[PDB]
Amino acid sequence: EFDAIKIALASPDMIRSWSFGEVKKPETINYRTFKPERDGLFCARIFGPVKDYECLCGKYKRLKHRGVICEKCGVEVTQTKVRRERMGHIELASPTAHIWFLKSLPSRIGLLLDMPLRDIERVLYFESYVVIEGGMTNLERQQILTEEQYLDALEEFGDEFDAKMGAEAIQALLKSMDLEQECEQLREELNETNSETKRKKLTKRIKLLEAFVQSGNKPEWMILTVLPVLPPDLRPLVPLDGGRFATSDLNDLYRRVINRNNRLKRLLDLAAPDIIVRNEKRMLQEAVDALLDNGRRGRAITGSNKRPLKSLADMIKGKQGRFRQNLLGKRVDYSGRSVITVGPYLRLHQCGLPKKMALELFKPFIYGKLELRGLATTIKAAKKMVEREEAVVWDILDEVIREHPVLLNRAPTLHRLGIQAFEPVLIEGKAIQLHPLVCAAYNADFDGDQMAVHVPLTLEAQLEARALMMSTNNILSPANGEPIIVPSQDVVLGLYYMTRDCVNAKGEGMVLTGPKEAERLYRSGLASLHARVKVRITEYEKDANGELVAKTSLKDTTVGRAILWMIVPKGLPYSIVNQALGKKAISKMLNTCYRILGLKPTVIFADQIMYTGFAYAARSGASVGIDDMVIPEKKHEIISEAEAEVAEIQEQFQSGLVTAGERYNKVIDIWAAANDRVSKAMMDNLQTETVINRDGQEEKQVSFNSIYMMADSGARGSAAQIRQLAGMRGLMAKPDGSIIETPITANFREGLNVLQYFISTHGARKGLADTALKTANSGYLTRRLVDVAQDLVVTEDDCGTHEGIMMTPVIEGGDVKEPLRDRVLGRVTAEDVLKPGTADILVPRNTLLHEQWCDLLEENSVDAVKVRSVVSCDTDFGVCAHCYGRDLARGHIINKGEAIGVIAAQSIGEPGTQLTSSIQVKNKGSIKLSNVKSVVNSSGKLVITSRNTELKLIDEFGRTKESYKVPYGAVLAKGDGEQVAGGETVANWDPHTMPVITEVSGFVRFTDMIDGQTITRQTDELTGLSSLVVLDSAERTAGGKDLRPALKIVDAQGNDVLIPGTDMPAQYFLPGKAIVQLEDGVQISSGDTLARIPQITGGLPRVADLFEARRPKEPAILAEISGIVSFGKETKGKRRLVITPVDGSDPYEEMIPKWRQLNVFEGERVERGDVISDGPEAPHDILRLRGVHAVTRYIVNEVQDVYRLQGVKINDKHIEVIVRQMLRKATIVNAGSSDFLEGEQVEYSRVKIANRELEANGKVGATYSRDLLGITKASLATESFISAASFQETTRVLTEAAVAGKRDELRGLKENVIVGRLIPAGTGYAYHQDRMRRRAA
């Protein structure tokens, strides 16, 4: 019926055409029979009838008289639902300005009229006069005069001078303004003048005025003359039960406005004095402003008793506004909720449902079935039978609920798996049963949790719920390609107990012909559950081309494992059930069985595993007792030794040998060592405490303790819990944040005292508060992340691009924390891979790297494969399937139409509640260096004169195992390609002071320095070395500020020493506080010391700042372009950074603070994007200097490092999608041929397509620079104003929309949800495509 929405500002004529009448009286009802009064806020003749086809006076009360208006009262005879869409108007007696356009964050009227907001408010407040059309009176067009000045001007001239005051004057000025003349004058000023601020202001003014001219709005329409009235029903006056009434605040605001307008009309008729007229006008302005937006201009008007009134803007805005509370989410029918239970007998695709809940839900279906079967003659009879609950309604319900799925949802929906579909099973009771396997996905427990039930209604909804939301259809997590239905506690414990051999048991060394007779021997009581026996087994292998090959052999296994072999599907080797079978082993087995067989065997195997684990756990019957906590016999001795050491340290402190801080450090270190010793001793005593003897002397095996098994099967508990149960719990933390020097020496088995309990209460309360706040922060972060990438949908199949992202393993200077298999599996390669030896062609370019390809790459030991990404996709308004890769929730490739942005945001935001000098080589390798300007010194060490040198360790496979940053002028023992051994020091340096060594040899002479002017003469008291300390600019005098100490190496002939390979002299201008090691008259050598210059938040605010693109507090200065450096003259500051290129000009200059240390020397050539200072790096500068790849790599690396430190595994595809969404806007440098401004900021896709069209034609394209914005800024800057208004700043968004006259095409998901139609993401993608292809055919 429609395809777009248009927003603008309403003219008085249009407002009058909207109105069905005028409202002249504030009367509501007649307090007797509650009839609607005439010409009131609920006037029947204006707003339609009250009852259906009933006249107000009663004359006409039948449908026969529909359409004719009464003559006694005028009330039209029609439906009463027209009272909900009919509006009135009020004729104001004086013009009133609009509060939104006056008090919006940018003063629209103020900057349109080039008048200050303060002055405009002064004129509106009836304080000062304003001149309009001054003429030849020597008065400006916007000059403001006081009362005395206006009187003086009127006395001199009675004509050719017009002055008004207030909204009338503002409207007159707006009408008199000439938009075209203002545009041409501002363009001429832009062309003539040259200033940054003036240019920006004139550009904003020209843009606003050009958009106003393009739109059909008029400047004078911003001042309200006729205002609309809300329909009665939207502000009801219904009688409350008990003879009382309920009313909204809009009725009172309208009453106030009407009464003040009537008073103003009366005063104007009665020729009231000017002061009274002005007071009444001010009251009317205030009343209209408070009606439109209460509390914006001044103090809010209080309501009936205490609370302030609610305005239309208040209803529109807020979390409880229409957009968020009643339009984005809405209460729905056919819903139910109750408490959940386990019901372990259920299958994965079914759940339990109470009979009463299903009878109440499927009432229309039962009615229809009863009518169709002929049991009930009428729907009323069917309802009576259902109320009576006969014996046939239950059969009808069983028939209808046989194959009708339902929806189960938990109140926190963190990710996609918060809502699933199941197949109902009628049960007796009032509690829902939920499958244990989906409990981890649902994040639900059984301590009073509740869940909601939703019934799909239509055929399409039922089929969608069966094919997409079914529990068996989603077993893999969308965040990471891992199973999500793995057993947690009871099944894991049962399988661990089953598959756990013993040294000596019943029937040891028995030869078994099959697991069948193994279970025989188990059940019959003639053999133990776990005894070492020989069993003949047959296994099947898929080595053939889809066929299975059977092989039979004798294996060494146990009875438990042989019995468990029955449920394994006939596709897996026997080695996957011949271990302890913990939780990780169970998950790996499930994943292997999935990836090898398919889906149905996976779910069947999972159900069989859960059944067997439950049964065998119940058969074992493990318990917990007070004797399970075994106390070591050395705890007291260790405590005594620790106390003796503490006493000795206290005596030493009392002797004055050590300070308080050193004493505290020693005490805490001793206590930590004692705690570690106690924990290690108790681990050793508990882990192998079970000792037995088989047919001989004695032997030791793993312990049989119940708590040890519980902690070693990964079901529950951990090392920290065991330490807190059977040993001291360590050091606590005072409320200040430090650590108390006295630890807690008592465990939970023994009795803690009041002091230790009171100490632990602090940590318990801190933990509870942190847990309370983490959820509140994560909700906001998740909402902000979802709202920025909700419009991203896969729309193409292959964009045909050649770009990609270079993927390498993560090395931090030690052990690899991210193998290359994880970062490459599931991605498509951007370029064809070659052989490791660069001899033959490897896997082709456009292949999908599955597990087989990954295994082949691992076997071949490929160093680094490059892959495509979504940030380099060429698809406009979406991404292609090939660039995205594959959906890491199903085995196949990503389908077309999927709204990947929502999945990415949900996966990123779900684990948010979980978040709070000498190089020593590790392993043998070959020393490798990259970008090193090394030279041989006089001692043989390979000194390095480059600040971009990375130390790398390459093994004989050709893989990188180590990565270190080498400081400048560092001593290196080895070289490049020299074989070394593990644990060998190769590099040494002084971190407390960087060297100023030179790369050339010769003489050092003293030129351009005077003792006292720039240097001081100081003698060391201890060492006695004579050195000349260089004073900085502030320490020295003003005369010597232009004479920097210049040290230059000269040879024996007196000339400057030429650097090998070049001829530029190497002179170094020492900065302040530069201690010179050697004086004049002593020859030096290359690589020798000459001068010495002295030199992380937790949680996820780092993640929040990274996603919001917040600039660092102390950004690192970077080099704009490559070239030499030419220090600048102090200009009320430290230095001027001027970089001279090889041949280009050097207009660039920077303001360097004097409190920041600098690294570059006088004659050092810098590169583009190279660092000049030290500190946090700014992402905007990173982008501007190194493209988009560097900044997306930096963001991905930072977020992955934070999540890995927190222990959460998330794929980087989501991060990449978020970065792409954040990298959507771009500014214009200069327009080649297409109309564009020099600083306008538009969408990147628009300029891209415009440039493609220009290049296809004979014209010349333009140039642009990519811009980086935060998530909220990108969400606010959206082509569709509806989505922007739904998120935040509704008043500002609506004001800007109205002013610009913007047109909104739906073209999205949130807009289609708001309007109430099919979204173009799932099944509606094809409908939307068909609609687009039909339109403009």
Partner 1 sequence: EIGRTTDPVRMYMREMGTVELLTREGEIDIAKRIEDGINQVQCSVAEYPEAITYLLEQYDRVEAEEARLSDLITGFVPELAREKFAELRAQYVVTRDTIATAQEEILKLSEVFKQFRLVPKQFDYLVNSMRVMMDRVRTQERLIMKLCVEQCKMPKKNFITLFTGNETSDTWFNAAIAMNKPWSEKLHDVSEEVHRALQKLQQIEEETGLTIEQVKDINRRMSIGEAKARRAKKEMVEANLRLVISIAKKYTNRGLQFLDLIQEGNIGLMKAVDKFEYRRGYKFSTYATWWIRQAITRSIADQARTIRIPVHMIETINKLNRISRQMLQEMGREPTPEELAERMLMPEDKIRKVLKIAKEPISMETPIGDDEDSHLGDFIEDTTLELPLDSATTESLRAATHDVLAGLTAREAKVLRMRFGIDMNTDYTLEEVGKQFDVTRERIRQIEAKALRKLRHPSRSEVLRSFLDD
Residue 883: which of partner 1, Mg ion, Zn ion, none does it interact with, CB under 5 to 8 A by kind? Answer: Zn ion
Q: Which is nearer to partner 1, 311 or 1033 (CB)?
A: 311
502 is in an annotated binding site: no
183 is in an annotated binding site: no
List the x/- string, 776-805, binding to Zn ion by CB under 5 A. Answer: -----------------------x------
Task: Check residue 388 for interaction with ligand 1N7 (CB under 6 A).
Answer: no
Give the CB-side neighbour count of residue 710, counting CA atoms within 13 A: 16
* 3-state secondary structure (DSSP) of residue 478: coil
8 Å CB contact between 843 and 864: no
The answer to the question of residue 304 lying near ligand 1N7 (CB under 6 A) is no
In whole angstroms, the minimum distance from the beta carbon of 428 to Zn ion comes to 56
Q: Is 43 annotated as a binding residue?
A: no
55 is in an annotated binding site: yes
CB 310, min distance to ligand 1N7, A: 17
The rounded distance, in Å, linking the Cα atoms of 1028 and 523 is 93
140 counts as binding Mg ion under rule CB under 5 A: no
Q: Which stretch binds partner 1 (CB under 8 A): 59-67, 1011-1019, 1051-1059, 1277-1285?
A: 59-67
Out of 241, 269, 1020, 1143, which residue is the one contacting ligand 1N7 (CB under 6 A)? 241
Q: Which of residues 473-512 bind Zn ion (CB under 5 A)?
A: none
Q: Which does 956 bind (CB under 5 to 8 A by kind): ligand 1N7, Zn ion, Mg ion, none?
A: none
Q: Which residues contact 833 (CB under 8 A, 6 or more apart)?
A: 842, 843, 857, 862, 865
Q: In angstroms, rounded to a whole number, what is the distance separating the alpha carbons of residues 667 and 646?
A: 6
Residues 1074-1103: x/- map of binding to Mg ion (CB under 5 A)?
Answer: ------------------------------
276 binds, among ligand 1N7, Mg ion, partner 1, none (CB under 5 to 8 A by kind): partner 1
C-alpha–C-alpha distance, residues 918 and 545, integer Å: 56
Residues 6+ apart with CB under 8 A from 626: 749
Whether residue 447 is annotated as binding a ligand: the answer is yes
Tell the smallest beta-carbon distance from residue 302 to ligand 1N7 (Å). Answer: 17
Q: Which does 297 bind (CB under 5 to 8 A by kind): ligand 1N7, partner 1, Mg ion, none?
A: partner 1
The Cα 1120–Cα 1148 span in angstroms is: 8
Q: Tell me phi and psi for residue 1157, to 5 degrees.
A: -70, 145
Q: Is residue 242 at the binding interface for ligand 1N7, with CB under 6 A as the rule? A: yes
Task: Give the one entry of Mg ion, ligand 1N7, partner 1, none that residue 447 binds, where binding means its C-beta sits below a cut-off of 5 to 8 angstroms depending on kind.
Answer: Mg ion
H-run or E-run covering 976: none
Residue type, 243: G
- Interface with partner 1: number of residues (CB under 8 A): 64
Beta strands in 559-695 (DSSP E): 691-692
With binding defined as CB under 8 A, does residue 777 bind partner 1?
Answer: no
Distance CA 1315, CA 471 (A): 31
Number of residues that bind Mg ion (CB under 5 A): 3
Shortest separation between residue 247's beta carbon and ligand 1N7, angstroms: 11
CA–CA separation, 991 and 967 (whole Å): 8
Residue from 59, 265, 297, 1102 binding partner 1 (CB under 8 A)? 297
Regarding 244 and contact with ligand 1N7 (CB under 6 A), the answer is yes
Specify which residues 733 forms β-bridges with.
Answer: 739
854 is in an annotated binding site: no
Residue number with CB closer to ligand 1N7 (240 or 981): 240
Residue 334 identity:
Y
Q: Supply φ then ψ for residue 1246, to 5 degrees.
A: -65, -50
Stretch that binds Mg ion, among 15-23, 449-457, 473-481, 579-587 (CB under 5 A): 449-457
Radius of gyration over every alpha carbon of the chain, rounded to an integer in angstroms: 41
Residue that the structure tokens 């009688």 belong to: 239
Q: Confirm or deny that 883 is annotated as ligand binding.
A: yes
3-state secondary structure of 549: strand
For partner 1, the binding residue among 324, 383, 588, 1184 (CB under 8 A) is 383
What span, in angstroms and rounded, lies between the C-alpha atoms of 490 and 613? 7
Q: Where are the beta strands (DSSP E) in 940-1056?
A: 942-944, 950-954, 960-965, 971-972, 985-988, 993-995, 1003-1004, 1015-1019, 1026-1030, 1046-1050
Residue that has been written with the tokens 């006249």 in this structure = 55
**631-639: long-range pairs with CB below 8 Å, 24+:** 631/682, 631/726, 631/747, 631/749, 632/678, 632/681, 632/682, 632/685, 632/726, 632/727, 634/678, 634/681, 635/678, 635/681, 635/682, 635/727, 635/728, 638/674, 638/677, 638/678, 638/681, 639/674, 639/745
Of 849, 883, 1090, 1268, which lies in the binding site for Zn ion, with binding defined by CB under 5 A? Answer: 883
For ligand 1N7, which residue has the nearest CB? Answer: 244
**892 lies in the site for ligand 1N7, by CB under 6 A:** no
Of 49-57, 438-446, 760-768, 1144-1152, the window that binds Mg ion (rule: CB under 5 A) is 438-446
Interatomic CA distance for residues 611 and 975, integer angstroms? 62
Minimum separation from the CB atom of position 447 to Mg ion (A): 4
From residue 250 to residue 279, what is the string marking binding to partner 1 with x (rule CB under 8 A)? -xx--x---xx--x--xx--xxxx-xx-xx
Residue 873 touches which member of Zn ion, Mg ion, partner 1, none, C-beta under 5-8 Å by kind: Zn ion
Q: Does 319 bind ligand 1N7 (CB under 6 A)?
A: no
Element (H, E) at 809: none
Stretch that binds Zn ion, among 52-60, 900-908, 979-987, 1196-1204 (CB under 5 A): 52-60
Task: Report residue 916 as tokens.
Answer: 């709070």
Using alpha carbons, list the distances in angstroms from residue 1209 to 883, 1202, 1203: 22, 10, 7
Tell me if 445 is assigned to a ligand binding site: yes
* CB nearer to partner 1: pick between 260 and 583: 260
Distances (CA, A) of 771 to 445, 784, 1207: 18, 21, 17
Residue keyed to tokens 């978020």:
1218
- Find where tokens 């190769």 sit: 986
Q: Which of 447, 543, 695, 840 binds Mg ion (CB under 5 A)?
A: 447
For the segment 100-129, give every residue that binds partner 1 (CB under 8 A).
118, 121-122, 125-128
DSSP symbol at 133: S
Selection from Mg ion, ligand 1N7, Zn ion, none that 799 binds (CB < 5 to 8 A by kind) is Zn ion
- Which of ligand 1N7, Zn ion, partner 1, none sits in contact with 238, Cβ below 5 to 8 A by type? partner 1
Pattern 184-223, ligand 1N7, x by CB under 6 A: ----------------------------------------
Minimal distance, residue 869 CB to Zn ion, in Å: 9
| CA dist list (Å): 852 to 437, 591, 604, 809, 959 | 30, 15, 25, 19, 21
* Residue 238 is a binding residue for ligand 1N7 (CB under 6 A): no
Cβ–Cβ < 8 Å for 246, 240 = yes
Which residues are annotated binding-site positions for Mg(2+)? 445, 447, 449
Give the footprint of ligand 1N7 on this chain (CB under 6 A): 240-242, 244
Q: Which residues bind Zn ion (CB under 5 A)?
A: 55, 57, 59, 70, 72-73, 799, 873, 880, 883
Give the binding site for Mg ion (CB under 5 A).
445, 447, 449
Annotated binding-site ranges: 55, 57, 70, 73, 445, 447, 449, 799, 873, 880, 883
Question: Which residue ranges make up the annotated binding site for Zn(2+)?
Answer: 55, 57, 70, 73, 799, 873, 880, 883
> What does the binding site for partner 1 look like in residue numbers (CB under 8 A)?
26-29, 31, 37, 62-64, 80, 118, 121-122, 125-128, 146, 236-238, 240, 243-249, 251-252, 255, 259-260, 263, 266-267, 270-273, 275-276, 278-280, 282-283, 286, 297-299, 303-304, 307, 310, 320, 377-381, 383-384
